Amino acid sequence: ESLNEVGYDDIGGCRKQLAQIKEMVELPLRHPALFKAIGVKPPRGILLYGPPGTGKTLIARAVANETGAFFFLINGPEIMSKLAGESESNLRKAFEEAEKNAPAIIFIDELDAIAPKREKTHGEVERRIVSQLLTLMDGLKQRAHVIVMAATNRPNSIDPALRRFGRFDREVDIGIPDATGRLEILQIHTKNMKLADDVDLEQVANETHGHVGADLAALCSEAALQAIRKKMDLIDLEDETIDAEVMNSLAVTMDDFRWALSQSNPSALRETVVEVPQVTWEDIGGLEDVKRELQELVQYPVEHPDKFLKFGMTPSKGVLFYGPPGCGKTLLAKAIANECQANFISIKGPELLTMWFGESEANVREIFDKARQAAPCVLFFDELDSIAKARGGNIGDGGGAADRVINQILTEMDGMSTKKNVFIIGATNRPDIIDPAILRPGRLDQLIYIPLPDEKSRVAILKANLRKSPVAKDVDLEFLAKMTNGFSGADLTEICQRACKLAIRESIESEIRRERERQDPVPEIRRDHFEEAMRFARRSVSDNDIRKYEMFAQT
Template identity: 65%
Template sequence: MEKGKEWILKVEEAKSRDVGRGIARIDPDVAREMKLTPGDVVLIEGKKKTACIYWPGYAEDIGREIIRIDGVTRKNAGVGIDDKVKVRKAVAKTAEKVTLTPTEEIRITGIEEYLTSVLEGRVVTKGDRITINIMGRQIDLMVTGISPPSDAVIIGLTTKISLSGKVAKEELRIPRVTYEDIGGLDEAIKQIREMVELPLKHPELFEKLGIEAPKGILLYGPPGTGKTLLAKAVANETNANFYSLSGPEIMSKYYGESEENLRRIFKEAIENAPSIIFIDEIDSIAPKREEVTGEVERRVVAQLLALMDGLEERGKVVVIGATNRVNAIDPALRRPGRFDREIEIGIPDKKGRKEILEIHTRGMPLAKDVDLERWAELTHGFSGADLSALCKEAAMRALRRILPEIDLDAEEIPAEVMEKLEVTDKDFYDAFKSMTPSALREVVIESPNVRWDDIGGLEEVKQSLR
C-alpha cells in the first residue's frame, strides 16, 4: 500500500540465511513500484526508525505486501512480526566516523579495524543495535554516534570505527532470542504465537468475543529439543518480561516457604505485565499428588493451581510449562483454564536439522568443504542441543589448531590470528565421532553370543539364513 512516497508493509520473519546481515527483503511487486535495485537503502519506521540494505524478495512473497527483516532489525524499528511499518527509499552516504558501545567488554587487539572489515557495507542509524559473532560468541553493539549526522549512513572501508570505553546497559528481563534462532519448529511456533502473542498484544479481541485468553501452555518432548528457547523467543518477540523458574529454586525445607516463592514470582510477573512465567521441569514441582509421599509437593501443586486460577489480568500474564514426562504431571493442572494447550516438541527431521545447523554456524567461519546438507543427513536422532554441541565442539577443534599462535598471558588477541580461524569438515567429523545423540542414548545394542551349534534342529531354516 502506497502512502505518498511511503509504503505500508507487513513485517514477516527473515529466513535463516539472512539473519544478522542488516538486509530487508521486500515483496517483488512493491519493490518494482518503489524502483528499488539490490543494494539500495530503505528506511523502516515503526515505533522507532532504522535502515536496511534492500535485497530482492522471494517468489513466494509476490503480491503479499510484506517486508522480511530479522529480529535485531525488528527491535531497532520497535515492531514485531505481523506489525505494519512505513518503508521508503533513501540515500545514505558513507560515514566518516561511527561510534559503537558494546554491551560487554571486548578484549581483542585491533578490534576497530576488525569491526570495519566485518561491518563493511552495513547501513546504520543512531540508536541501532548490531549483533556480531566473534569466535562463536555473540556480541551486541549499540550505535551511539554517527558522523556526519544523518538519518542513515553506510559503513565503508574508509569509515573510522570508534569503540566507546563504556558498556551499554541491557534490558535483563527480556531475552535476546528471536524466532530466527529456532530451527525445525515451524508448527510449534505457529501454535505458540496464536496462544501467546495474540492475547499479549491484542487482549481486546478476547474481550470482544467475551472469552478468557489462554493462561497456560504445556510444552513437552525429549530434553534438548528447544522448549526453553521457544519460550524465550516468544517473550522477546512480544516484549514481555521473562520469569524462569525450576524445581530447586522453589522448593525449600522450611514450612510454607516453597509456596511463598511461587506467590512472589507470580506477584512480580503480574506487577510487571505483560509477562511470561516459564516453569522448567514442571513435573518436579507438580507431580501427581496421589503418587507423592511428601506434604511439601502436595502443597506446592495446590498453590500452583490456586495461582493459575487467580490470573485475572486477561492475557497479560501467560504461564508456559516444560517437561519431558508429561504423564507425571498432576492431572488437575492439565485441564482447560490452567494449561489450555499442550504442544509436543519432538526430535527434528532432516529439514529441521539443516535449519538448526545453519543457525549454529551462522557466525562461524566455515571452510568451503563443509556441506551442511550432508551433516543434516548424518545426524539422525540428534536433538537441537546435540547439534549445538556438535557445532561448538567442531569450533573448539578449529581453535585448538591455532592455540600455539596465541599468547595466553596477553590481555588481547591479535586480529590477524582471528582471521586465520576456520572450521573445516574434518573438525565436524572429529566432533561427530565423539558424540552420541541424546534421543538414542538410552537404546543399548548388545550383540548376543549365540552360535549356530547352540540351536537344535531347524536345519533347513539355518541353511536359508546362512
C-alpha cells in the same frame, strides 16, 4: 545480552509447533484489547513438552521478547529449593508481579520438579507447592494477561490435576528436529561462527539422527574447538596466544565437524520421532495398483470431504498392508506421508515386542497419544505379527490369537476412530496369524496386498535404488531383473548394495595400488560387479510363503 538474545529467528528448525505457540500467545498478548471476550476466553495453560533440550526455553523467550511482554522466569528447581514456606511466597510473588504488569508470560521450567506426578511426591512440603500452583492457576482466570507456559520434559510426569481444563490444557509438542530443521538450528548456531567452505551443513544435519537442540549446538561447539586444536601447534604461545592474529585466521572445516559428528558427540536421545518422510512415490518403482488404492483412502477422501458425506460412508481408516517381507510396505507408507504432508511416527516390531516381553502394555496408550498430538500423522505399526511369532508359530501355538499389546491396540484404535486425521497402517508380513479382531469394521478394514515385485516392478525398483549411485552404461538393468522372478524386494536392493561393495573394493584397491606405483578406474558400477554380486544372491521368501500369503488373499 544482545549477543545471545532471543527472537523468532534465533529459534529455528521447529516452525510447525512454534506456529501453534505463537498463534496461541501472540494475538492475546500483542492485541489483547479486544480481550477475546468478544470471542472466547484466551488460552491460559500452555505446556510445552519435549526431550531435555529442544528449544523449550528458547521458544518461550522468542514468543515473549518478540511480542512485548514481562517474561518472569520461574526455573523449576529454584522455588522448590528455597527452604520451607518460601516456595509458596516466591510463586505468589512472581505471579502477582506478572499480573501487576499488564502483559506477562510465566515460563515455569522443569515443571516436573515443582509439580511431579502426585504419587512420587511423598514429602508433604513438596505437595503444598503443587496445590498452591493449582489454586494460583485457577485464580489466573479472568486475570488481565497471565499466560503461563511450562517446560515439562514429558507431559505424563506432571500431576494430572495440572493438566485438566482451566489449568494446563494447551499441551503442545516440541519434537526432535528430524531433518532439514536441525540444519536450520546448525545454521543459526554457526552464522556467528566461520564455516571454512566445504562445510556441507546439509550432510551434517542428515547424519545426525536423534540429536536435539543443545546437542547440535554442542556438536558445532566441539567442531569449533577441534578447529582450535588443529591450530594448537600454532596457538602454543603460553604468554599471549590469545591475540586475534592466531584466532581470526581460523574456521571450521568438514573434517573438524566430522570428528565431533561421529566420535566425540555420543550424547543423543532416541525415541519415537515424528518425521515428515523424504521418500517419495517417485522412489517406489511399480506398485501402481496399490498406489491408486492408497489414494482412495488418505488423499481423495480428505481432498473431497463433502462427497464422502452426502453419499455416506465412513472412510476406511486402517489399511493393513500384507505381503512378502521387504516389499516396499515401509517405503510405501512413508511415501504416502511425503505426498500428504504428515508425521510418520513409526512403531517397529521390536518396539511392540518389548512391551509383551516386558509386560509393559501401558506404554501403548502413550504411542497413540503421541499420534494424537502430532496430527495429521501416520501410525505405521510394522510387523504386528512379531508378538504372535514370539508366542509361537501358526495360529499362535502357545494359546490363542490374542496378546497383551495388540489387544490394547485394538482399544486405542477404536478410540482414535473418532480422530479424522490419523491413519493406522499395519504391515504384518505373515497375515494368517494376526489377531482376527484387527480385521473387523471400524478398526483396520482394508487389506492391500503388496505383491511380490513383478518383472516390470523389479526393473523399476532396481532403477530407483540405483539413482543416488552411479550406474554406468552397459549395466542394463532390464535383463538383470529378468533373471530374477521371485526375489522379494530388499534382496534385489541388497544385490545393488553388494555391487557397490564388490565395485568399491576394486576402486580402493586400485587406490592403494596407485600409492605403490607412485613410490579412477571406471568409478561407475560395471556389469562385472553386478554379475559377481548376483553370483551370491538369494530369493528371500521362498514360493511357500508366496502361496501362503496368496492363501490370505481369500480374505
